[PDB]
Design a protein around this nucleic acid. Structure first.
Ligand SMILES: [Zn+2]
Ligand SMILES: [Zn+2]
Ligand SMILES: [Zn+2]
Lengths: 176, 88, 153, 376, 96
RNA sequence: AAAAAAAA
């Protein structure tokens, strides 16, 4: 009898980034209402031997799961990259692995503040524009010239501590 | 590929090409728009005239010199005026 | 399905290009070479541990976990495997996946003498029509959207 | 950056030893340095400070080792003993770096006392700890839990306590024993052969066996098969009464039941917990075990006893009620004694040597237990 | 580039700067703008857009077409606040 | 009593 497996795409990250990601998610779930509605699952809520934590993000009627992983031997020689992250988009029994940048883009469709439709019209009438975008990781593609110009003339907000980003969590630093 | 700027007589064309393309290829590119034979023209870079036989590598210009966000600028002439763009 | 194939062929893909890429087994980096080969081969035989393969020049890695760890087994219209028979000194890896909404097969081979090899990605035509159409459409609609100038002030 | 002492409120806030505390974001390291030989006052003693989320170079452990490497040069033909009292146990990176540091330096011994264990459930931290401490081919580093005496020493020598006596908080002994069991589990501590031989003898007439030992292992159900959870395995003993510890001493069974809830077992799965005891449970411990088993329907209990502990006849009632709750009670035979020797003892490769009359005593005890569980 | 602008299939649309400069850019690149796409005759004259604004919008055409499909390591697109409002006006007019 | 821990 042949063996069976599940195959994942795991981004190799260092434990410090995972700690910060956890801290930011918790801070914006509880202290700020910005990430309110997200769910955090502790390591002891998962039977998986390697799962370290899960973050579930409702996206309308679908769901985005960010999973962190423990005890992967793949860790680097210096153990720069012992741990790992994976991203999934689930709806009912359908699932798909998701790119980190597309993950941030999908997140920004639902949660944080962005320029409103009247932002352009207000800007050319010389008025003040509000709300203004505060999540620049959600605009990682090549956007319209309108968005680039507007973001140029009015600067985005810089939340402290920074809003949680899947792109920043899983960005290649060891190899650069 | 890279993108190029050619400005002369308040006239300009925006086009892309390859790295090792010789200046003859650039003149062929501008021919289809200017209806003027290639070898007659001579390009200009940094107010320096360009001879008929010239190559990117020989010229020293590289891909990092010409970007979609900041393409290399060179002038053109017929048988030169580096006219600046408008200002706010 | 035509949209999926067009995406696969024409889209900057996921950061994991379909072109052949050199991959290596990363496990037990520290231990000596012979120990690494022995442990890797034993894991490939048993099916009880996990095995990871990293693209040499990037951050992406493919992880095979035992299907038991996941808990409830997942229905598999297509078959993944880690074969050790087609060649004396090579292991062949086949892994179906769904990436960014398009179904693909990742195929690789590792040489146990050197513990490295080559992997590539191809389009999967069989399961695309078997997967739920509503979920495909929902994800497609979601990814086509932009946050900008969307909210009604 | 060092301070001579800390204020009373700082000490009480940071060295509180509840295993799971939030909002303790600073690490305090009280250190003493002495020279090997007859007891004498420390050559140097101070306190380092750090934040858990700061840069690794700014962690108190790294700062101590940087200071020590330079200060160590004044007399290199000197061999030193170093003692740490630290509120949080070092992190994974610090553990690895200290392992390297101690490998570099042969003439230095390090003993660490910790109020709490930081991230004790992380497999990578557990591996790093085993590398630092358990490995006898590695550095000579000891790690222990702070008890009453250590807390009192810190209050006396590292706190601004103006003629004020140390006052323990409520559950100091309870938390200490929980953390001691957890650390022994992580470090895979083993029983020495003499203790096993003296305590697990099944001769009916025993003299001087006043303490009860208990070796535990856990199994999980999957695919109609019992798979060992190698993490959950260890041994423990009863706590003798102490004025600073438990006034009336705690029985091993109660400590075991206390530690079980910290494992965070999944209520939707099935587990089997196997215990090997030198004495069978007393009446009160049997009642407590029966109540636990009744409440936690997802756990099955198996007890293998070397002897039957009887007193006043309530012990038989206790065994009967514990059995009726759903536990399985048996008598250790050759197989179980050998398994315990090979699993929980530091045998150093030596084989299990049975003593005189083992099998006859096992048979007599099995008959007695059958009579007890059948007669009511 | 043998494609003849004068012909129906031009390969190049002519853009006239209100200031007095004229550029020319491929039909595909102009297709990324709604207004010019709807209009396109092979010549376009803009009433208001200055020369430098036209240059920046055309450079944006080039940039987006180059990186429309790439989603990896997209480079920055420089902008300056003194030109941001007029560039935004041009973009709103062109529906870029 | 709770804190799985940069939720300060
Ligand atoms: Zn936004
Ligand atoms: Zn540390
Ligand atoms: Zn008892």
């Amino acid at each position: 009898m042949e063996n069976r497996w599940q195959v994942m795409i795991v981004w190799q990250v260092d434990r410090m980034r995972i700690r910060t990601w956890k801290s930011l998610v918790k801070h914006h779930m509880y202290v700020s209402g910005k990430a309110r509605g997200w769910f955090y699952r502790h390591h002891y809520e998962s039977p998986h031997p390697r799962i370290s934590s899960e973050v579930h993000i409702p996206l309308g009627d679908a769901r985005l799961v960010i999973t962190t992983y423990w005890g992967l031997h793949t860790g680097e020689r210096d153990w720069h990259l012992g741990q790992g992250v994976s991203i999934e988009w689930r709806k009912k029994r359908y699932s798909t692995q998701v790119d980190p940048e597309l993950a941030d883009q999908l997140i920004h469709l639902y949660y944080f503040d962005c320029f409103s439709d009247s932002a352009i019209r207000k800007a050319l009438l010389g008025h003040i524009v509000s709300p203004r975008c505060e999540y620049q990781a959600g605009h990682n593609k090549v956007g319209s010239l309108q968005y680039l110009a507007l973001a140029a003339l009015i600067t985005p907000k810089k939340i402290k501590p920074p809003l949680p980003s899947v792109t920043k969590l899983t960005e290649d630093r060891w190899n650069k | 590929d890279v993108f190029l700027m050619i400005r002369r007589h308040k006239t300009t064309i925006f086009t892309d090409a390859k790295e090792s393309s010789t200046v003859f290829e650039l003149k062929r590119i501008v021919e289809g728009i200017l209806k003027r034979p290639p070898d007659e023209q001579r390009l200009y870079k940094d107010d320096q005239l360009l001879d008929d036989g010239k190559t990117l590598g020989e010229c020293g210009f590289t891909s990092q010199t010409a970007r979609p966000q900041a393409p290399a600028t060179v002038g053109l002439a017929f048988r030169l005026c580096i006219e600046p763009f408008s200002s706010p | 399905v035509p949209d999926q194939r067009s995406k696969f062929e024409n889209e900057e893909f996921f950061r994991k290009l379909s072109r052949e890429c050199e991959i290596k087994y990363t496990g037990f980096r520290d231990r000596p070479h012979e120990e690494r080969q022995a442990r890797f081969q034993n894991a490939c035989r048993d099916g009880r541990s996990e095995i990871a393969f990293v693209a040499t020049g990037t951050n992406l890695s493919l992880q095979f976990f035992p299907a038991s760890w996941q808990g409830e087994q997942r229905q598999t219209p297509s078959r993944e495997y880690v074969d050790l028979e087609r060649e004396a000194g090579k292991v062949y890896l086949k892994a179906p996946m769904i990436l960014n909404g398009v179904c693909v097969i990742w195929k690789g081979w590792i040489d146990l003498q050197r513990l490295d090899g080559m992997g590539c990605l191809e389009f999967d035509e069989e399961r695309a029509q078997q997967e739920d159409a509503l979920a495909q459409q929902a994800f497609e609609e979601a990814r086509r959207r932009t946050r900008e100038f969307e909210d009604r002030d | 950056n060092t301070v001579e002492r800390m204020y009373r409120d700082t000490f009480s806030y940071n060295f509180y030893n509840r295993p799971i505390l939030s909002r303790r974001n600073t690490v305090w390291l009280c250190y003493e340095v002495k020279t090997k030989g007859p007891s004498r006052p420390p050559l140097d003693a101070k306190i380092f400070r750090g934040q858990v989320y700061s840069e690794l170079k700014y962690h108190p452990e790294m700062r101590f080792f940087h200071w020590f490497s330079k200060w160590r040069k004044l007399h290199r033909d000197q061999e030193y003993e170093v003692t740490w009292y630290i509120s949080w146990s070092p992190c994974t990176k610090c553990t690895r770096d200290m392992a390297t540091f101690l490998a570099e330096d042969p003439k230095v011994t390090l003993t660490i006392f910790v109020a709490r264990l930081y991230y004790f459930w992380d497999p990578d931290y557990q591996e790093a700890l085993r590398s630092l401490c358990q490995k006898r081919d590695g550095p000579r580093a000891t790690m222990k839990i702070m008890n009453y005496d250590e807390f009192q020493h810190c209050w006396s020598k590292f706190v601004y306590s103006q003629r004020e006596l140390f006052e323990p908080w409520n559950n100091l002994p309870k938390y200490y024993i929980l953390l001691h069991i957890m650390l022994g589990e992580i470090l895979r501590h083993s029983m020495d052969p003499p203790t096993f031989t003296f305590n697990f003898n099944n001769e009916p007439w025993v003299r001087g066996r006043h303490e009860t030992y208990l070796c535990y292992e856990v199994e999980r159900m999957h695919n109609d098969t019992w798979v060992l959870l190698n993490q959950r395995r260890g041994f423990l003993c009863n706590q003798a009464p102490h004025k600073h510890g438990f006034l009336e001493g705690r029985h091993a069974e109660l400590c075991f039941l206390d530690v079980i809830p910290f494992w965070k077992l999944d209520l939707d799965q099935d587990y089997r917990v196997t215990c090997f005891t030198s004495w069978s449970p007393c009446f009160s411990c049997a009642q407590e075990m029966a109540k636990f088993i009744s409440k936690n329907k997802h756990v099955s209990l198996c007890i293998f006893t070397a002897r039957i502990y009887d007193d006043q006849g309530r012990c038989q009632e206790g065994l009967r009620t514990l059995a009726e709750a759903g536990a399985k009670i048996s008598i250790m035979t050759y197989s179980e004694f050998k398994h315990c020797w090979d699993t929980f003892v530091d045998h150093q490769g030596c084989p299990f040597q049975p003593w005189d009359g083992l099998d006859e005593h096992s048979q007599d005890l099995s008959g007695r237990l059958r009579a007890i569980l059948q007669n009511q | 580039t043998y494609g003849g602008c004068e012909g129906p299939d031009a390969m190049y649309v002519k853009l006239i700067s209100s200031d007095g400069h004229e550029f020319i850019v491929k039909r595909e690149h102009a297709l990324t703008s709604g207004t010019i796409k709807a209009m396109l005759t092979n010549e376009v004259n803009f009433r208001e857009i200055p020369s430098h604004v036209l240059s920046k919008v055309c450079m944006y055409f080039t940039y987006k077409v180059r990186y429309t499909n790439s989603s990896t390591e997209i480079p920055e697109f420089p902008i300056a606040p003194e030109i941001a409002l007029e560039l935004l006006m041009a973009a709103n007019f062109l529906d870029c």
